[PDB]
Amino acid sequence: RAQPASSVSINLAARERFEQLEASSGGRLGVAALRTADGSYVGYRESERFPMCSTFKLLAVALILKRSMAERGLLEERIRYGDAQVVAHSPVTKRHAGGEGMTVGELSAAALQHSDNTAANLLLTSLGGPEVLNQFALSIGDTWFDLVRNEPEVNASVPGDMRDTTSPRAMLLDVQKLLLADDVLGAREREQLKAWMLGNTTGATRIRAAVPAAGWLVADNTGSGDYGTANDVAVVYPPSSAPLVVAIYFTGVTPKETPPQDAIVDEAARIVFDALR
Numbered sequence: 011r012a013q014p015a016s017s018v019s020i021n022l023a024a025r026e027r028f029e030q031l032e033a034s035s036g037g038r039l040g041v042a043a044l045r046t047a048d049g050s051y052v053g054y055r056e057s058e059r060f061p062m063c064s065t066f067k068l069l070a071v072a073l074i075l076k077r078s079m080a081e082r083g084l085l086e087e088r089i090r091y092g093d094a095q096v097v098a099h100s101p102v103t104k105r106h107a108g109g110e111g112m113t114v115g116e117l118s119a120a121a122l123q124h125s126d127n128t129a130a131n132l133l134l135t136s137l138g139g140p141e142v143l144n145q146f147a148l149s150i151g152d153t154w155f156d157l158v159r160n161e162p163e164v165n166a167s168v169p170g171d172m173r174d175t176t177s178p179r180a181m182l183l184d185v186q187k188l189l190l191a192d193d194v195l196g197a198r199e200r201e202q203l204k205a206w207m208l209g210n211t212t213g214a215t216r217i218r219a220a221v222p223a224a225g226w227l228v229a230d231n232t233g234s235g236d237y238g239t240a241n242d243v244a245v246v247y248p249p250s251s252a253p254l255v256v257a258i259y260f261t262g263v264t265p266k267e268t269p270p271q272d273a274i275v276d277e278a279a280r281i282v283f284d285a286l287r
Contacts, residue, residue: 017050024285028054028278035274037238037262042178043282046190047252052285056182059154059175060259061167063233065241066143066157066174067121067130068181071206072188073137073146074114075199085115089132097162100128122206125232127161134160150187150194154180167235169262181243182257189229189245190253204229204245215272216242217256220279222287225249238263240270242279256282 032039032054040055078084090111096104102120106112112120117133120126137143140157147155157164158173166174187193189200189207207229218228230244239261246254258278260271 011049013049013051017045017048020050020285021052024052024281025054027281031274031277031281035260035263035271036268037260037271037274039274039278040178040259041257041278041282042182043254043256043286044182044186045252045254045286046186050286052282053179056179057154057177059156059172059177060241060261061165061171061233061235061239062155062157062174062176062181063165063167063235063239063241064121064125064127064130064161065176065181065231065233065243066155066164067133068188068207068231068243069143069147069152069155069184070130070133070137071118071122072184072195072203073143074118074133075195075203076146077137079196079199085113085118087114087136088112089114089117089136091128091132095131096128097131098127099162100126102126103128103132119206119209122203122231123209123211125210125212125234131160147184150184152176152180152184155184165233165235165239167237167239167261169237169264176259178257178259181259182255185231185243185245185257186255190255207231207245213242213244216240216275217244217246217258217279219272219276220283221246222280222283223249234270235261236266236268237261238268238271240272240275242275254282254286258282 233241
């Protein structure tokens with residue numbers, strides 16, 4: 011797509027800042043960000059593969075929402091599961107194992123608002139597994155998304171492992187297509203997906219931490235993993251402005267036990283907001 015002349019210059023200036031941040035970081039940084047009003051854009055390693063961690067759950071919930079347009083009551087279907095299926099970082103689903111279960115819509119909310127790993131797994135199984143989700147990615151024009159495992163193994167983020175990866179640009183394009191265009195999801199479904207992502211509670215140290223002033227909203231999707239891995243993909247709603255789309259992936263710090271480098275994602279988002287101001 012086209013961009014204003016200013017965007018070409020600003021992207022070069024942003025790239026120098028991203029290079030310096032990455033050089034300090036111990037790892038590898040990937041960014042794609044778009045100002046939808048005019049097409050201004052910044053990219054850094056935008057077509058490299060990064061571990062998705064649980065950011066795959068955006069496509070999983072989107073596919074279920076697409077199917078719910080024809081399958082009435084899909085979101086009300088109840089799924090039951092045992093304690094043995096409750097994996098790490100499952101703050102909602104751990105309360106409803108056994109006879110009670112959760113509906114598909116409740117699982118979608120838990121996955122998108124609390125990064126509930128078991129919820130993501132249950133939705134992935136419900137839709138038909140990783141290969142079916144990859145086919146959905148391809149159907150929306152995403153040739154990079156490549157899910158192989160489920161949680162917690164997807165979060166392993168081993169440096170050099172290309173399984174369970176996507177690119178920042180591919181995810182940016184997916185966020186735009188699923189939330190800001192009408193070719194995949196209907197208007198009510200886009201609104202529900204947006205409402206779930208606006209209510210995410212796991213993003214306070216990432217893109218949300220970088221917003222420059224009060225009055226901004228962020229509809230995001232985080233992922234976290236081993237080797238310092240911290241990701242955040244979002245639509246950002248600035249005051250009196252058309253939306254921005256921001257996809258940040260960061261990974262690859264040894265040792266394995268390095269915690270997600272949220273502060274790097276925060277700073278990358280600050281560079282983005284400066285470039286797109």
